[PDB]
């Protein structure tokens, strides 16, 4: 007879090319806001 061939190796079908990981989660938003300045000395505040 003419029995055909299939004997494929471990690495030839096991470590195939792969879908690459979808790069995501680029977390970046902002710094928190700054509050205004309302502090004074003694001499300028009362004298």
């Amino acid at each position: 007879p003419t029995l055909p061939f299939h004997g494929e190796s471990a690495y030839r079908t096991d470590y195939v090319p792969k879908p690459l990981p979808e790069v995501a989660k680029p977390v970046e938003v902002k710094l928190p806001p700054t509050l205004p300045f309302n502090a004074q000395s003694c001499y300028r505040s009362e004298y």
Binding site: L35, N38, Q40, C42, S45
Partner: protein
């Protein structure tokens, strides 16, 4: 120019006074720009002060009387705690005497007309209408502020809600009654009032 310079009462009082000075210079040795003592101010126009019955009274109605501004906010818990003590002080000050000693002008830091009305219906002294520009022009004059919603001109943040301040005839401060100040003896600072030497002459 008292207590500060970069506030709108003083900017308007200056402008009216040197326009008076240039008017008399053009009509007639006249010293320019006018002295701080020689300048003049009307603190409230014809429709500012209103009593409990909502009848308007002008400035001359307060002569011979110790007039104190009272900056207050209805939702503020300091204000809610202070208001009965101020009521009692005003009561027991103006009952036992030959004549009337003091008056309290209510200046409102509230957010809404109905909030102003609800916090106003508990007060027997005078007040200032909320949508009148005089209330926040007085705020900017006397440097009272709960939080920075007005751009400040390098001021001092003198005091927050609530405050009672003794005012003079031209809008200067005579004495500060220390509720929330450097001193902060709240609910008792009313007795520091010196209503004899503080008079709306």
């Amino acid at each position: 120019s008292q207590p500060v310079f970069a506030s709108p009462l003083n900017v308007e009082k200056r402008r009216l006074n040197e326009e008076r000075a240039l008017m008399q210079a053009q009509k007639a040795n006249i010293q320019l720009p006018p002295n701080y003592g020689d300048m003049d101010l009307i603190l409230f126009p014809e429709g500012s002060l209103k009593n409990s019955n909502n009848t308007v009274i002008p400035q001359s109605h307060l002569k011979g009387k110790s007039v104190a501004l009272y900056f207050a906010d209805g939702a503020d818990p300091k204000c809610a705690s202070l208001l009965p003590f101020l009521l009692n002080y005003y009561r027991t000050m103006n009952e036992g005497g030959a004549n009337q000693k003091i008056e309290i002008i209510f200046v409102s830091l509230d957010r809404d007309r109905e909030a102003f009305e609800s916090h106003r219906a508990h007060m027997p002294w005078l007040s200032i209408d909320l949508e009148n520009p005089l209330t926040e022009i007085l705020k900017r004059h006397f440097r009272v502020m709960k939080e920075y919603e007005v751009p400040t001109y390098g001021y001092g943040s003198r005091t927050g809600v609530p405050s009672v301040i003794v005012i003079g005839s031209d809008g200067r401060e005579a004495q500060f009654l220390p509720i929330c100040s450097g001193l902060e003896e709240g609910d008792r600072a009313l007795l520091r009032w010196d209503w004899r030497n503080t008079k709306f002459a």
